[PDB]
Amino acid sequence: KCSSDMNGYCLHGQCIYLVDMSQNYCRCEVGYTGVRCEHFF
Amino acid sequence: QVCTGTDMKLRLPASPETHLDMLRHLYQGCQVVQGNLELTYLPTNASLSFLQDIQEVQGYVLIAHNQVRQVPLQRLRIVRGTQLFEDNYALAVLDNGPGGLRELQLRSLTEILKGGVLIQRNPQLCYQDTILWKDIFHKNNQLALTLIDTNRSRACHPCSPMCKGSRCWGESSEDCQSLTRTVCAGGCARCKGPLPTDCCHEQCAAGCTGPKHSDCLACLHFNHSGICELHCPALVTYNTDTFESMPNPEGRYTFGASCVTACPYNYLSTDVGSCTLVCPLHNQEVTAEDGTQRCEKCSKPCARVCYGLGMEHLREVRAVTSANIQEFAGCKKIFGSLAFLPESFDGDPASNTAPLQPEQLQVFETLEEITGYLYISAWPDSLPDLSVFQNLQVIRGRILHNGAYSLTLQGLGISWLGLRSLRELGSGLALIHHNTHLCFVHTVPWDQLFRNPHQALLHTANRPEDECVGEGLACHQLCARGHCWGPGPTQCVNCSQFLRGQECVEECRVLQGLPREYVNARHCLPCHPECQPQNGSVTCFGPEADQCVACAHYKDPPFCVAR
Amino acid sequence: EKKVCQGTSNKLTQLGTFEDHFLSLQRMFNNCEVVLGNLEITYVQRNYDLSFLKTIQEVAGYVLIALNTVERIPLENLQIIRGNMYYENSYALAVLSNYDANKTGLKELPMRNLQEILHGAVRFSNNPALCNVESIQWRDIVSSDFLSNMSMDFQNHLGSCQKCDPSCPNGSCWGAGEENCQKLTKIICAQQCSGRCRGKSPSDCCHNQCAAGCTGPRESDCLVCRKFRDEATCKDTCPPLMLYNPTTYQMDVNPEGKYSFGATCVKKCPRNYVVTDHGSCVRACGADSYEMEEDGVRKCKKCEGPCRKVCNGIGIGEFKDSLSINATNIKHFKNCTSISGDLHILPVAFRGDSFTHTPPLDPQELDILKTVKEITGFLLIQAWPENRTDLHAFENLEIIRGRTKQHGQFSLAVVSLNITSLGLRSLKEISDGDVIISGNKNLCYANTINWKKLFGTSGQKTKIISNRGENSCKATGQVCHALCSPEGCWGPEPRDCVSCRNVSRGRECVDKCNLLEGEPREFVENSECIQCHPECLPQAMNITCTGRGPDNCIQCAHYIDGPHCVKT
Ligand SMILES: *[C@@H]1O[C@H](CO)[C@@H](O[C@@H]2O[C@H](CO)[C@@H](O)[C@H](O[C@@H]3O[C@H](CO)[C@@H](O)[C@H](O[C@H]4O[C@H](CO)[C@@H](O)[C@H](O)[C@@H]4O)[C@@H]3O)[C@H]2NC(C)=O)[C@H](O)[C@H]1NC(C)=O
Ligand SMILES: *[C@@H]1O[C@H](CO)[C@@H](O[C@@H]2O[C@H](CO)[C@@H](O)[C@H](O)[C@H]2NC(C)=O)[C@H](O)[C@H]1NC(C)=O
Ligand SMILES: *[C@@H]1O[C@H](CO)[C@@H](O)[C@H](O)[C@H]1NC(C)=O
Ligand SMILES: *[C@@H]1O[C@H](CO)[C@@H](O)[C@H](O)[C@H]1NC(C)=O
């Protein structure tokens, strides 16, 4: 789970957090791709 | 250390008294010879100590017609042979034979890339036959021509017993050949010993000392800073990440068989870094505002170009005749050379070769730059100087007469030179011989005309000092530091006063004189004649008549007119 | 041969659910060998298959294996990793954090043909169960350039794995069966050559441009090329066309020379790239340059005069890290004429970013991009305000080169919009790329464009589906046009026919330009009647103006100057 800093970070996705990587991270949906979920198919 | 090498195939030297002196001036201090190591017509008692550091010769080595006892080429490492004497010959030793070549003593020479060996008519050499030339030659030309002389007319000692194989060059113990090809094991190109560990790098050509690629004896393609490889790094590195084009800050220039930081004068740089003598088509020689030049691409027509000797339009002819005098009409920068052979003023019947006229030589008045050599060997009794070439500024000398000279004067009736605007001699040397009328040869500042440390004057067989003192052959005191060209007061290269129309004078007529002239920073030119002469003051300032304090007849704000 | 695989740029990112990302990974990387992007094998569960990964030969970017549960990833034929992109600015092979709550993740990874990594380094961490990868040395793979920044650890806790194969030297085996050990080519090798070697013989090593071993001293018997690739051989740089000549001292034709397009050497540059003096197919030329064609193909010459400004765009140069054009970088495209890069119109720009502290984009600021004329890369449009119905911001967009494409296939991507017309009235030529129109709401007028006469590059398709429907634009407010060619219409406005019947004055068309009942008299010239000399008196039921010039009239207006009609 992410904090309140990542409210407007993910474009079309939900923020999840990794323990070992310890970086900001998004989760794209069906039909969405990219680093911050900004590109289409 | 870059010397261009001579181009004497089989002809006699122009001056035999200064030919060894020419070899001493040009072949001393050289390490990588860009041209040909040619030693022609050297008699006995010849100090050949200048051959102690020449290692790489890019062309063919020709030792011919020499009466010396030996040629010290023990430090000769590799003979590449980009140019060859005959069709398939690189190391030719001919007609050397008391005198004659006793031993060759080629110690470190173990690699000849392209060409063959021509040893013939030398009855003073012992070991020309016992040299395994297959060990020296490359694999692609293993079926080369190996003509070896047989007649010797002198029995000598056998090889030294300390080294086996019976492969020796002379009689000394350190003067026998070590094999570099047949002693190897496996697919090694060159090796130090019979062990597979002692093989060399694949770019090493003349052997190595260690297994690394930075310590060859003489590697093959392109050397820079020791580390040598197949292709020299260019100036533009093509990236494959975003398919962009980035220039290389660490990219060197291609110069012969090596790569340097920047290749020297009389080598025109290109876009690929391969600087050479002449540039290809669709290119113009421009100035890179730094003392060096670098030709680049030009516009679509690119007409108005002048060609000379040694170019596309002039290959076979050597003498300037009336058949090609139209091609040198009005051009200021001749790409090529100009040679005045003694056959250029002779009348040959049934060949349509008319001799030149003194009034026809006035077409070279606008000439300022010659890219080649100036070989003048015939001159009529019209005028005793070079006033037809009085505006010649710089001689590049990229094409040289016999590869060694740029300014050659042979058998002329010339009395003074008259080369006023000559300020820079690029390459080659200066040879004046058998000219008993030219006196002003040592008064010319030849040290300020040079651009390389390997350039010097070679004067012999000329008018001595005794025919120049009693006859009064000395110019005026206007030429400073003894730097004088001719007896006239208009041929000082640097005088302490100003210039009234390319002529050094005593004093500008500012306070005196019936006309008035304004003072320039270096020159001394006349302004408009209708300015009123100020008796005892500075009369004229500039060329426009408005800067006078008073003028002659009519006073108008722009200038002063007589009507 | 050698099917080009595109690759992804979505580092660690999960696409949908686990099964959705698995199907996207199966769809994206199927039947492809050379990966120009990034092989990113993420989010694979226990009971799934990865048999499609066997055909991948080489990856130009970085291999990113993270968060996997499967016991085997078949990266068997992965030969060489070039490493044209970095993850942590120095790393290429990052197998990181492959574990479960039972600490069961990637058990074995037999990277058998992996023999050399040119750029990047290797970091291995967080692997509880991992067979024989801890015995693999990496001095053999990674050279002495990037040896400093690499670091890895191995914590094999209760792995219960079997013994390695002692039939290979130094104990370095990838798996556990036969011929599954590392083909080491560096430490047991002679130092008589800087390249790789296939055996322990000192005189049997590879070419200088042959990387990851070879199968002979000849440059043809070679697996991959190091920097530049030749056709079935490996060279340092393939030469240009016009070389030197020792015979005629002029320019001579090439015996084996080709152009340089990327790694490989092709014979001809494509029609949208720039031919330089060095003989390499480049995208963008130098800084002090002027891109202008001379003979058919596009070239660049040295610019003279001011040499004012070139537009880098998005993705290259200064804005490589940015992902969309916004209000911050809109001031750098005011007096811009040629977009020598990419553009990204995304919904993140029209909503404001609190992370990067950017203001919301004004929709009235889209008129700054009227000045530009061409786009060398791709035009990605995924957002538009809900009031304007046409894309007139690219009205003066003449040509789209398509040097860079979105995911290597599409150039003009107008998707998820709220427009009724494309409005690209000056789109006359597209040199490369596909045009996709999908996911829109009310955008018809797309099947009557006839895109086959637009692009000339073969091997390209089109894809327009599910936008408005064929029966929804049947009404009187939605018609193509009447009395004009059916080759192309862009909107309902009459200025949108590509080719008209008689009259093509400017950007619009009419019935006819009146030579009988009209005050402007316009002579027909190539079906484009333009205005003649304004000081020419119109005739009565006669042809007034013939051609462009005052000498094409019968009666002048005010005065007569020979054949011409002048004002004074
Ligand atoms: C609106 O446009 C802006 C550009 O005009 C854009 O701003 C960019 O925001 C990015 C997200 O943070 C930045 O990555 C980008 O450049 C950064 O600038 C920093 C200095 O301020 C650098 O320190 C930074 O370097 C490193 O950053 C991270 C650290 O982990 C690395 O991931 C990165 O690779 C690099 O090593 C980086 O260069 C920034 N560009 C500019 C010009 O400021 C903004 O995001 C846009 N807003 C949107 C799209 O909503
Ligand atoms: C390759 O180039 C290097 C660099 O010039 C050569 O090294 C020089 O060799 C001369 C030989 O007398 C020395 O005087 C210089 O001092 C050397 N330079 C340096 C920086 O040490 C080298 O000889 C060339 N040839 C080979 C085969 O490496
Ligand atoms: C992947 O390619 C193979 C090759 O024939 C094909 O059988 C398979 O259906 C493809 N996978 C998908 C998901 O289309
Ligand atoms: C990698 O090592 C180099 C030393 O060559 C160092 O300069 C650099 O900072 C390191 N880290 C990177 C590239 O992230």
Numbering used by the authors:
A (entry chain C): 5 to 45
B (entry chain B): 24 to 120, 134 to 599
C (entry chain A): 27 to 594
Give passages from the manuscript.
The proteins in the human epidermal growth factor receptor (HER or ErbB) family are some of the most thoroughly studied receptor tyrosine kinases. Ligand-induced homo- or hetero-dimerization of HER proteins initiates a downstream phosphorylation signaling cascade, which stimulates cell growth, proliferation, and differentiation. HER2 is unique within the HER family in that it does not have known ligands and cannot assemble into ligand-dependent homodimers. Thus, to facilitate downstream signaling, it must either form heterodimers with other HER proteins once their specific ligands have bound or self-assemble into ligand-independent homodimer under the condition of overexpression.
Since Domain II of HER2 was presented in the unbent conformation, it dimerized with EGFR in an asymmetric manner, consistent with that of the NRG1β-bound HER2/HER3, EREG-bound human EGFR, and Spitz-bound Drosophila EGFR complexes. It is well known that different EGFR ligands induce distinct EGFR homodimer formations. Particularly, the high-affinity ligands EGF and TGFα stabilize the symmetric dimer, but the low-affinity ligand EREG generates the asymmetric one. Thus, to verify whether different EGFR ligands might also affect the architecture of the EGFR/HER2 dimer, we further analyzed a 4.5 Å cryo-EM structure of the EREG-bound EGFR/HER2 complex. This structure is almost identical to the EGF-bound EGFR/HER2 complex, with a root-mean-square deviation (RMSD) of 0.63 Å, implying that the asymmetric EGFR/HER2 heterodimer is a common structure resulting from various EGFR ligands. However, for EGF- or EREG-induced asymmetric EGFR/HER2 dimer assembly, only the unbent subunit of the HER2 DA is required, but the bent subunit of the EGFR DA is dispensable.
